[PDB]
């Protein structure tokens, strides 16, 4: 067997390029978008999350309860992206002997009002994926159970768009190889997305209009964006039991190079800096 395990850092500014030509001397980056051809917006990464009135998932995911969900929804690349994933992050203590998981399905760009307010149906979702004997049929019904419990709790519980995190993602790893998987996050930007304010942010749908992927959104009121000062870097590996990570991994993670900072969230840290007048519990790092 063998052991996975994952740890971020914090990368200052003046050291990044350094430390991205070191993991690009063992690890090419992973290009992924290998069918329409090269943009530069493709590496762009912006997730909606979202929560209610009572901040309840982010106290969730603060603490990290057994079951604990984070809603978000994702695109990549630019505002001509119609691809829409509609994600949900579940945490699972060790105690539980399941591990924490994440799930997302597609919706065209068109239909995500429609269905976080319940006037679009699982079962429409996915009728365009049924017609098609393409997915295999349980696998296509955990699609409609998540799309389902995710539509249940956005009403049940109220939730809304509360804070937007936007970042340039670059990923390495060498094909065939999966002992080390690194990610570095660069640009990246916390922006309110709720009401919590009487402002209406949103206008009555699930992502600001204002802006896109316009970094560093400057026509943003520095009450509802945070530039974050560093870049952040995630190193995941696996390890056969008796083998050793490679040796230039373990040097470059111990270096001044990096800083670590395990557990740190992109939704947290948004919220609370965002929105620090209504919350009464904080990350470490702060």
Not at 59 to 68: S, V
Not at 94 to 103: I, M, P, R
Not at 119 to 137: I, L, N, S
């Amino acid at each position: 067997n063998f052991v996975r395990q994952t740890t971020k850092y914090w990368v200052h500014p003046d050291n990044i390029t350094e430390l991205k030509l070191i993991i690009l001397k063992h690890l090419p980056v992973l290009v992924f978008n290998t069918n329409k051809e090269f943009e530069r917006e493709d590496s762009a990464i912006t997730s909606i999350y979202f929560d209610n009135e009572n901040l309840d998932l982010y106290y969730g995911r603060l603490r990290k309860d057994e079951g604990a969900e984070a809603h978000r929804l994702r695109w990549y690349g630019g505002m001509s992206t119609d691809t829409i994933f509609v994600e949900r992050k579940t945490h699972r203590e060790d105690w539980t002997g399941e591990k924490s998981v994440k799930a997302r399905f597609a919706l065209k760009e068109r239909h995500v009002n429609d269905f976080l307010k319940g006037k679009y149906t699982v079962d429409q979702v996915f009728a365009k994926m049924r017609k098609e004997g393409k997915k295999p049929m349980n696998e296509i019904e955990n699609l409609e159970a998540l799309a389902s419990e995710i539509q249940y709790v956005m009403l049940k519980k109220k939730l809304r768009p509360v804070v937007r995190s936007f970042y340039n993602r670059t990923a390495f790893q060498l094909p065939g190889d999966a002992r080390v998987r690194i990610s570095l996050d660069t640009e990246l930007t916390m922006v309110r997305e709720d009401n919590f304010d009487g402002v209406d942010r949103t206008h009555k749908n699930w992502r600001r209009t204002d802006i896109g992927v316009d970094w560093p959104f400057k026509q943003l009121d520095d009450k509802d964006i945070c530039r974050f000062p560093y870049a952040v870097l995630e190193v995941k590996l696996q390890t056969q039991l008796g083998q050793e990570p490679p040796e230039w991994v373990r040097e470059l993670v111990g270096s001044h190079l990096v800083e670590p900072v395990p557990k740190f969230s992109k939704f947290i840290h948004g919220v609370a800096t965002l929105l620090n007048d209504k919350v009464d519990s904080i990350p470490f790092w702060l």
